[PDB]
Design a protein around this ligand. Structure first.
Ligand SMILES: Nc1ncnc2c1ncn2[C@@H]1O[C@H](COP(=O)(O)OP(=O)(O)OP(=O)(O)O)[C@@H](O)[C@H]1O
Ligand SMILES: Nc1ncnc2c1ncn2[C@@H]1O[C@H](COP(=O)(O)OP(=O)(O)OP(=O)(O)O)[C@@H](O)[C@H]1O
Ligand SMILES: Nc1ncnc2c1ncn2[C@@H]1O[C@H](COP(=O)(O)OP(=O)(O)OP(=O)(O)O)[C@@H](O)[C@H]1O
Ligand SMILES: Nc1ncnc2c1ncn2[C@@H]1O[C@H](COP(=O)(O)OP(=O)(O)OP(=O)(O)O)[C@@H](O)[C@H]1O
Lengths: 525, 525, 525, 115
């Protein structure tokens, strides 16, 4: 069919309508006092959420242009989600404030490119000021505190994260599992981590999780492209005889090998999850050899000579439990001997000793780190399977918050960080009047999440915003008790990384959307 | 009746639509290359004009709100016309530029009262800078030059204005009428000028002129209110017996005395033109005695004892000619004896000598000035009555331009004055960002008339505006020859007073119109 | 009330639609083969004419804008009519061609003022080339020929105009009347002609004529304004007692004196025709004294002392016949003694001898010319009153054509004059591209009347236009015989003055209308 | 050649004297001449500056002088490195002229039914 084009300020007001709709629909849920939002269910009772991601995924508009605007702000919110794990409401509120003030200025004849440049300069200054104001969370006490706060005031979850954090170290790996006993369980077993995702989202057994959890699966290692599914035919026959889940690691999986795997998984006789080969080149081959050592498998390459057709059940690796994340994959309790793993550790350590390239040396160092450090597993201990699933979700998002805090730092939560940074950066000027206007847009836009939270509490937004701007340091307004004080004292804390990512992505999408004149679209039919 | 109210930005965009319509309709006529505008006459051929006043009076819009806007900008344009005599297109273009940029700013959430303050500060700075840049026109040569330029390159008209300027001095009275001979005739006869207007516009015999010209009229002098028309009944009977025009000076004329005079003038058996009593109190009585001395009349007052009923033909004053302007009235060749006028001059001169109050002394000084200086009369001399009427109009508006130049000064015309004083004041700042924005509105708005003139010439407005801004002094772009150079060299000159009045009135009306939200209106029926 | 404004190219295409409608409806009647046009008569049968003036007066459009255009082009057509007497179709065709090509160029982004300047330059060159190509018509034979051709091939009418032309000389007065006998009558009697029109068209007894013809009227002479009708009351009573038509000469007649005279004429008990006082000042007074000598009347002035109330039947002048044209008035066979007229001739001749001012001497010379030459009288002689009225109309418009030819000259008719001038001026260039375009507009526009005539003849317009452009001199295409040849040979001749006036007026109105953007109007209700 | 559209501006300045075999070919030459200035005007318009002012400034300068859009300052594109191949500009101008000349002389635009 044909297409429709609308360009100028009409497209800008269209996309502004769209972002206003989605931004309000997600910003109702912001904060601890955020109001509930009811979402569609096509069959049965509608669902009720306070989660910004859940409501954001559902929103799409009937008219094309506002739909475009909504989808842009939604995809930048989900990008901030995948980068950080939380704060998507904060990111969308910041996006709304910047986009609204930016196009309000653009309608006043102000130069959009200069506004984008001013916003970029102001948000760079805001990011460096956030890094200046960041408080380290490397100590175990603050780690336990933020784990408690994130997991709905549960000192058990944050505590368990703290001992696991000690177990696998500062940049180690912690994995959540359901435990049978009512006591919480912590174990340390050698595991594998690599940053590769699923080939198709249809491989996910649990759409509420977003990951592919397989128990005692056979693992195949490949360094070649899966050009045809006839290479996978003997493997599929063998795994159908075995009747167990199957994991595939290959260099490239073509669209039709993936299509046949999707056909097989909707048939579901075989349980096949395929991921790309992580790393690059010789590093990729070496770490695939490490994985084969960990699982007792064998790496298949066209250059060496073996083929995917010539695959036996012994040649495939095996492990006790694997989880394929959205862009990550973890392997727990591989069959491969710890002595061979230690020998591989020694080999790559001597590779570190002979390494002259700095980047290659860092690759070998992270290889020995993942090969020797292993993985801590926290098994949830309580009485009911219901509290298994909710406490498991609490451990998951609390661990995401904890690793976000460990990665960069932690600042006083509740939006007071942006208020304080805005107070510290009111002096920033631009190269002309327009860049100064864009700087003013950014500065008055960082105050938006606090105003939204206070508005959700029922208090006067501008009053509390002026009060917090009057205070200095970490003084702010506890929304839960609705009393003023130090966020550090009440424990209301947000990671530096999540706020930095939310602000950066909101500023990027708003500067991109300000300079949008032509909004072409499909014909509404 | 029942009425509709619209307040907010909707009323602002309504009035912006209206002012844009009127401003385009009048800005087509700006400049020497200004395009023709055709106006409907209800009967016969439609008129074609290049006059901004003529088209401006003609504009009324069909919807009520845009009509409100058009009426406001029209009345400020006519106020600038009555203040100066020309430049109403310049005033309306300035008004359009200020109002458009101001409401574009107010649409961006900018503070309207602060915009008013910033515009006020920038325009008073522009006025004082324009007074600094003014060139005196007190010498006779530049007076003749500006009289030539204003009267469509006629050195005869400007010359005659120059000898009249010599005849009655710096602030004297010059009156033009039609001479029989083919040579122009300059005479000096003792006369009167006082700043009082007609009671009704229906008294005007020539609506194209706007003044009541009467030949050999009887003049009545009164210091009392005309409460009833029975006081005017014997006077009306006497003037009907005489069959000559009649002029009335009274303290007050009531609405029903005016109504009966309107009835009589549309009957027109009597020719009655009535004015207020000029001056105030004892000063008014004294100068009315002076006028009675000038015309051989008698002042009628209730306090002394005589009444308007007890009026004879001898008691009324008389003169050879009178003219009653819109807010002025002059008397030429009164009957009253020059010896009695000289005695009155001596009496008020001794009053000056005994005067102790400064303002009263100035009143007596201007009294002796008008009583002794008299009136110069210029009689138009050529072959045809057609060139009588067009050359008379040329002498009239050239004389208005000349007295405007004499009053304050003359600056290089063609809009380069506003460009230069704009260049001189780019450094002016405000008490905050809002006033700085309003100052920027004023500065980029003073560049509008030059852009409109150049646009009418067919050249690129922004290029020529940048060229003029590049040049300094009086350098600019002659539109008539379409060549750059010095306006003083090409003689393109505008009075300081007309430009100052246009700028002040446009800034006042636009800042006033900015702070208008509630826009009540009658029901559209 | 409510008024609509349309400006830009939309108003231009509106007025183009209007001028196209009027121009088509009037160009149907161009030429000897011009097709007939029928017009509504509200009562009875509709009228049928080939007269461009008759149809052009009637044309007016239902929508306002095209009506405005039509009224403008009708105004310039009637201006060319009352300037010349014929050729209004030619003027309107020229106006259509110039306006159409001009707005077609304006729609192409061309500068309208430069196009107007180019048209002005090209039409000035065309006028001077026409004056170069003009053939004198001072000879009596060519005068008789053009009188024959103009009066539908009647050698009697042109012959009688020739003897009258000999009788009153080169610039004398010729008047047409009805004669009883079947032989045509010519008689020279001392008379008056002065260029003054009626106060109101309601004074005209014959709307088909446009003039006020009165037989044996009493003539009043006045040098004062008629402020009130009480001055005319004894005169009206005396002329009601006399029961004869009345003529009034006054300095000014006010709108209410005119209103009362209009009331009296629609009452029609009195037959009053009023005119302005011709001349100016002392010249006006002197020639009014001459008219009083011619008619035995008396001049009434306020300055001398006598009044219009003190008027007797003897004081008023009298004559055998008067005619009051649209802007002219002639008097035939005044009562006043020829000896007193000769004495006045001697007095103004001595005034010529003592005259030093050139213009005053020329005024006295034309005074003695009109006072001594008199008036030639051509009374139509034939059998029927029907042929009286048609032959009288033929003598009228033939005499207008004859005096037009005598005034400036005669050129070959049929539109070949404009073709030849266009051939002589194809080399004319402008100061830039746009002025050359406007010159091209004018040059290809003067070819329009010949193309329209040939199109009315049924021949191919462009073919005959190229054939005539190929020929040189006075070679052209006779439409009556539809054969080529020299226009002089079969006598197709047009006066230089009528063609020059038509072309000048068409160029002026097209230059005025090209630079027209704001076409304001009343509400369509 | 120095990029930023100054190539077309300069060659337009070099060829303003070119005439045609009649008035119409001179008009078409004027179309091409005023049309080669379009990319610079569009770039400057995107920068937020006045297009006609900067275009007149570049036409005032000669050689490789022009207006750097990245720094928004005047100067030599050879100095700032703003460059474009002669082949790409020549091909763009040739193809635009060919399609516009082909499209001017297009009267009959036949089509399918709008359904
Ligand atoms: N007690 C509190 N007082 C004040 N502010 C609080 C408090 N608890 C949380 N906040 C603030 O409210 C926000 C937390 O909102 P919420 O937990 O609903 O989701 P989010 O992190 O904003 O986003 P999402 O779940 O969509 O990724 C953060 O900005 C946090 O700093
Ligand atoms: N030759 C010229 N070159 C440049 N500018 C000129 C020239 N002649 C006049 N101007 C300018 O054009 C304007 C004159 O316009 P115009 O005489 O039509 O009426 P106006 O004074 O603008 O207003 P209005 O008649 O409505 O009171 C003034 O701003 C004057 O400075
Ligand atoms: N025999 C002829 N051959 C060619 N052209 C002719 C001939 N007779 C007249 N013409 C031309 O035709 C026109 C005469 O037209 P017509 O008598 O209908 O009125 P007009 O002069 O055009 O205008 P109007 O009557 O409206 O004032 C003139 O241009 C004249 O030169
Ligand atoms: N710094 C600069 N200053 C001025 N002009 C520049 C500058 N950088 C690039 N340009 C000009 O901008 C244009 C480059 O635009 P862009 O890279 O978006 O794509 P393009 O070459 O126009 O076309 P497309 O990508 O569609 O094939 C060229 O005309 C180039 O000369």
């Amino acid at each position: 069919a044909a297409k429709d084009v609308k360009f100028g300020n009409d497209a800008r007001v269209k996309m502004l309508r769209g972002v206003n709709v989605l931004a309000d629909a997600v910003k109702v849920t912001l904060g601890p006092k955020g109001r509930n939002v009811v979402l569609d269910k096509s069959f049965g009772a509608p669902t009720i959420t306070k989660d910004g991601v859940s409501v954001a995924r559902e929103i799409e508009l009937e008219d094309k242009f506002e739909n475009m605007g909504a989808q842009m702000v939604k995809e930048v919110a989900s990008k901030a989600n995948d980068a950080a794990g939380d704060g998507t409401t904060t990111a969308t509120v910041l996006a709304q404030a910047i986009i609204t003030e930016g196009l309000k200025a653009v309608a006043a004849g102000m130069n959009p490119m200069d506004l984008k440049r001013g916003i970029d300069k102001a948000v760079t200054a805001a990011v460096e000021e956030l890094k200046a104001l960041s408080v380290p969370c490397s100590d175990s006490k603050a780690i336990a505190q933020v784990g408690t706060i994130s997991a709905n005031s549960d000192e058990t979850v944050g505590k368990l994260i703290a001992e696991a954090m000690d177990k696998v170290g500062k940049e180690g790996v912690i994995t959540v599992e359901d435990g049978t006993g009512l006591q919480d369980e912590l174990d340390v077993v050698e595991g594998m981590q690599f940053d590769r995702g699923y080939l198709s989202p249809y491989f996910i057994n649990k759409p509420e999780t977003g990951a592919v959890e397989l128990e005692s699966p056979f693992i195949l290692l490949a360094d070649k492209k899966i050009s045809n599914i006839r290479e996978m035919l003997p493997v599929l026959e063998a795994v159908a005889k075995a009747g167990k889940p199957l994991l595939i690691i290959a260099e490239d999986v073509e669209g039709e090998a993936l299509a046949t795997l999707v056909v097989n998984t909707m048939r579901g006789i075989v349980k096949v999850a395929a991921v790309k080969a992580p790393g690059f080149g010789d590093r990729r081959k070496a770490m695939l050899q490490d994985i084969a050592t960990l699982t007792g498998g064998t790496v298949i390459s066209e250059e060496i000579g073996m083929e995917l057709e010539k695959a036996t059940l012994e040649d495939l690796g095996q492990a006790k439990r694997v989880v394929i994340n959205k862009d990550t994959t973890t392997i727990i309790d591989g069959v491969g001997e710890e002595a061979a793993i230690q020998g591989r550790v020694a080999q790559i350590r001597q590779q570190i000793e002979e390494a002259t390239s700095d980047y290659d040396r860092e690759k070998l160092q992270e290889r020995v780190a993942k090969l020797a450090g292993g993985v801590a597993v926290i098994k949830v201990g309580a009485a009911t399977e219901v509290e298994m699933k909710e406490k498991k979700a609490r451990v998951e998002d609390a661990l995401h918050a904890t690793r976000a805090a460990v990665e960069e730092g932690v600042v006083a939560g509740g939006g007071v960080a942006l208020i304080r940074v805005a107070s510290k950066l009111a002096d920033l000027r631009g190269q002309n009047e327009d860049q100064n206007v864009g700087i003013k847009v950014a500065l008055r836009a960082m105050e938006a999440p606090l105003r939204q939270i206070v508005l959700n509490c029922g208090e006067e937004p501008s009053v509390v915003a002026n009060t917090v701007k009057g205070g200095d340091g970490n003084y702010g307004y506890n929304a839960a008790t609705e009393e003023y004080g130090n966020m550090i004292d009440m424990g209301i804390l947000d990671p530096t990384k999540v706020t930095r990512s939310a602000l950066q992505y909101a500023a990027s999408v708003a500067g991109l959307m300000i300079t949008t004149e032509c909004m072409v679209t499909d014909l509404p039919k």
